[PDB]
Design a protein around this ligand. Structure first.
Ligand code: OAS
Lengths: 8, 310
């Protein structure tokens, strides 16, 4: 999963 | 003709009409998977480097540094490889594993950390590596670098306008850095002068844009939609040109991607699924029933084999 800027 | 290097081959991606979404083909998709490193990030990966070169901030002997964690890393990697720059990318572990797999093959210096396995630790580490002869490391900062929406304003937008013969009524795009919808909206609204509907898409699990605009408590959260939902309002998102915000859930996004594959024969990613879901919801409103909706498909499903997509 992703949050504060992850996976961009 | 012939491009000097791969970075010059960015863009010019096709528009494909959907048959199982929208209302009588009012939904068309721009397949950004058809790019040199097979995502929308190729454009900004190229242009940020080019601009840093023109500003003199990027020179021979200086090393590239950023955080990305996603496709921006791959784009920057291929551009750095093509134009002769050493590059260090910061990220904990590890989603997704193909993201992690390509970067090593492209010869980027992967510095692996773990705050709680997060971009806080990654960005902190990036800042730290920069703080070591800062005239040797250059951070491109995709979340605030104006070259990011600039390239979208100069290529993606004009491509949409050109290919729709100025008939585009709505642009639907998920928001990660905000660069895509910002650049595109600026191009079509300001440079071409057509009053379209710019639609930002975000995960319902982390709807910080909706919460902000509604003046409610901003509560970011975890989600499975790779590429968007940064959990904050990035500087490269121009709220001023955002006409509408749509929220999509992870499950529906995933299912929509699978549907694109099985029903449209389109190898699209998770965020592509989200964008298409939102666009379909808009498309089946009478208000947009007779309007041309253009939907950005950022990446390709083959970059998600390790994920819950398959
Ligand atoms: C846990 C942490 O540092 O938050 C950052 C977040 N997990 C990310 O990488 O987007």
């Amino acid at each position: 999963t992703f949050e504060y800027g992850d996976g961009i | 003709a012939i491009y000097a290097d791969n970075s010059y081959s960015i863009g010019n991606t096709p528009l494909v009409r959907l048959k199982h979404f929208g209302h009588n083909g009012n939904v068309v998709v721009k397949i950004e998977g058809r790019n040199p490193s097979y995502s929308v990030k190729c454009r900004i990966g190229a242009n940020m480097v080019w601009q840093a070169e023109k500003d003199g901030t990027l020179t021979k002997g200086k090393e590239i540094v950023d955080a990305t964690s996603g496709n921006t890393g791959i784009a920057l990697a291929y551009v750095a490889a093509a134009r002769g720059y050493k590059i260090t990318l910061t990220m904990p572990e590890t989603m997704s594993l193909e993201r992690k797999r390509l970067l090593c093959g492209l010869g980027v210096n992967l510095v692996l950390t773990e705050g709680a396995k997060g971009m806080k630790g990654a960005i902190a580490k990036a800042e730290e590596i920069v703080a070591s002869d800062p005239s040797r490391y250059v951070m491109l900062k995709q979340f605030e670098n104006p070259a990011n929406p600039q390239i979208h304003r100069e290529t993606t937008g004009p491509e949409i306008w050109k290919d729709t013969d100025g008939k585009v009524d709505v642009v639907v795009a998920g928001v990660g850095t905000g660069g895509s919808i910002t650049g595109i909206s600026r191009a079509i609204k300001l440079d071409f002068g057509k009053q379209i509907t710019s639609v930002a898409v975000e995960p319902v699990e982390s709807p910080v844009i909706s919460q902000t605009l509604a003046g409610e408590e901003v509560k970011p959260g975890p989600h499975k939609i790779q590429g968007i939902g940064a959990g904050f309002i990035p500087k490269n998102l121009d709220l001023s040109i955002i006409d509408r915000v749509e929220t999509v859930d992870s499950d529906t996004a995933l299912a929509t991607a699978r549907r694109l594959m099985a029903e449209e024969g389109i190898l699209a990613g998770i965020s592509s699924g989200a964008a298409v879901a939102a666009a379909d919801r808009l498309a089946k409103l009478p208000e947009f029933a007779d309007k041309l909706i253009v939907v950005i498909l950022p990446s390709a499903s083959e970059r998600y084999l390790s994920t819950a997509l398959f």
